[PDB]
Design a protein around this ligand. Structure first.
Ligand SMILES: Nc1ncnc2c1ncn2[C@@H]1O[C@H](COP(=O)(O)OP(=O)(O)O)[C@@H](O)[C@H]1O
Ligand SMILES: [Mg+2]
Ligand SMILES: [Zn+2]
Lengths: 280, 82
């Protein structure tokens, strides 16, 4: 379903959504089983929580001691679970006429906590729940408009021995260099040396950990300068697709600070933080 | 009493008891028996002292706050000391 097609009819039903993660709150402890201790006889009992309500006892459950209202909650002995709140923004494609994309809040508990990072495309299955909002802190009064959110039950972020036996077969091929150089950029024609140079950058040198000095890194830097119409930008895009991480920065569209890192402040936490530039 | 100088007060009371008993039975006067009774009462008092009890007025109903604690120990004294 689309984020703009959820109606009241579809409340309390299992739906499937896809979107982009925008922001996630830190871990929130959610109580599961409460712990009570009698102030008089030092008797301890555990009571369950139903619908966010503690089934507190009126008086001590022991027979000899029955002092009413003498039970107290020991905060640090109650069982707890994990809770987290995420904000999901619909994919840019779904936007009908170029407006601000809508967002829907999600809740994930236990294992699914810290499963999706900020700025990732995920597909989430959960229950489309509804819940009241209290008009003010100090009253049971409720607003007539209900808040909508999704109770997530599954999240999907959108080597075998057989493969290893297969991979080891290619390495035996005598013309492996040509095969890989021809497969890295199928479309580009008669640039075998350029392709070979590009390929060796993906593999990279060898890493060395080195005390009594500094680390030595096997990273290769390549410059492709030549006449305009030749396939330079095409190879740039082709390699940009293959690599797992990379930023397609251009000329005059990037800044000195923008490449390295930007100093900023976090509004939510009100602390000085720094972002990661294109190079970082 | 139990802590000061490793409880030598008990040793002093015992010494008084030895001084009393040293004299002969037929020569013992009522004062010696008084002193022996005093020493025995001292030992009984030392052993018997125990924490008191928490008494609370009940003129009105139990408040919904309820009893918070029933501790009835002095500031510097813990249970293991006595
Ligand atoms: N050897 C080649 N193989 C495939 N396409 C080529 C080749 N030479 C030129 N072209 C074509 O010419 C165009 C060159 O544009 P572009 O790669 O953007 O040049 P540059 O990025 O160097 O300005 C490409 O769109 C590409 O389709
Ligand atoms: Mg170019
Ligand atoms: Zn009790």
């Amino acid at each position: 379903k689309g984020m703009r097609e959820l109606n009241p009819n579809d409340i309390d039903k299992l739906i499937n959504l896809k979107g982009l993660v925008l922001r996630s709150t830190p871990v929130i402890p959610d109580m599961k089983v409460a712990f009570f201790k009698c102030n008089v006889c030092d008797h301890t009992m555990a009571v369950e929580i139903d619908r966010g309500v503690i089934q507190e006892p009126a008086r001590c459950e022991r027979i000899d001691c029955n002092e009413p209202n003498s039970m107290s909650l020991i905060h640090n002995r109650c069982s707890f679970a994990d809770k987290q709140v995420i904000k999901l923004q619909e994919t840019p494609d779904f936007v009908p006429d170029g407006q601000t994309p809508h967002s829907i809040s999600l809740c994930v508990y236990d294992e699914l906590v810290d499963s999706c990072r900020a700025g990732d495309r995920i597909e989430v299955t959960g229950t489309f729940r509804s819940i009241p909002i209290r008009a003010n802190s100090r009253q049971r009064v409720l607003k007539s408009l209900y808040k909508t959110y999704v109770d997530v039950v599954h999240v999907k972020k959108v080597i075998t021995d057989q493969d290893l036996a297969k991979i080891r077969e290619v390495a035996a091929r005598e013309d492996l260099y040509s095969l890989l150089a021809r497969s890295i950029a199928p479309s580009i024609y008669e640039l075998e040396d350029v392709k070979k140079g590009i390929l060796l950058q993906l593999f990279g040198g060898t890493n060395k950990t080195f005390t009594k000095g500094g680390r030595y890194r096997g990273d290769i830097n390549i410059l492709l300068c030549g006449d305009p119409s030749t396939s330079k930008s095409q190879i740039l895009q082709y390699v940009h697709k293959i690599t797992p991480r990379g930023v397609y920065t251009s000329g005059k569209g990037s800044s000195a600070v923008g490449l390295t890192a930007y100093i900023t402040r976090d509004v939510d936490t009100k602390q000085l933080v720094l972002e990661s530039g294109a190079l970082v | 009493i139990l802590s000061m100088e490793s409880g030598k007060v008990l040793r002093a009371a015992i010494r008084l008891a030895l001084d009393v008993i040293k004299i002969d039975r037929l020569s013992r006067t009522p004062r010696d028996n008084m002193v022996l009774k005093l020493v025995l009462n001292f030992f009984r008092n030392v052993i018997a002292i125990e924490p008191g009890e928490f008494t609370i007025n009940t003129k009105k109903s139990m408040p919904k706050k309820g009893i918070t604690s029933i501790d009835t120990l002095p500031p510097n004294v813990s249970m293991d000391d006595i």
